[PDB]
Amino acid sequence: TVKGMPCCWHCEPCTGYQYQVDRYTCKTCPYDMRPTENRTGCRPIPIIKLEWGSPWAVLPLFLA
């Protein structure tokens, strides 16, 4: 954060959906992009297709 004196700053953490793009202000990346922990941008959201189907997909398969 830009303080009164341009001398000592204060890096206040942004929200969970805000990426540290610049050093003075955060930005917002599009959907399916989770902000990374480090200053790298936004990583893609891991998407699956229910291959195993253990919790609530093996009983329908067995009945079928």
UniProtKB/Swiss-Prot annotation:
Entry superkingdom: Eukaryota
Tissue and organ distribution: Strongly expressed in the cerebellum. Expressed at low levels in hippocampus, hypothalamus and thalamus. No expression detected in liver.
Residues listed as glycosylation sites in the UniProt record: N38
Record localization: Cell membrane
Disulfide pairings: C14-C26, C29-C42
Subunit annotation: Interacts with PICK1.
Role description: G-protein coupled receptor for glutamate. Ligand binding causes a conformation change that triggers signaling via guanine nucleotide-binding proteins (G proteins) and modulates the activity of down-stream effectors. Signaling inhibits adenylate cyclase activity.
Family: Belongs to the G-protein coupled receptor 3 family.
Name under which the protein is recorded: Metabotropic glutamate receptor 4
Span covered, complete protein: 532 to 595 of 912
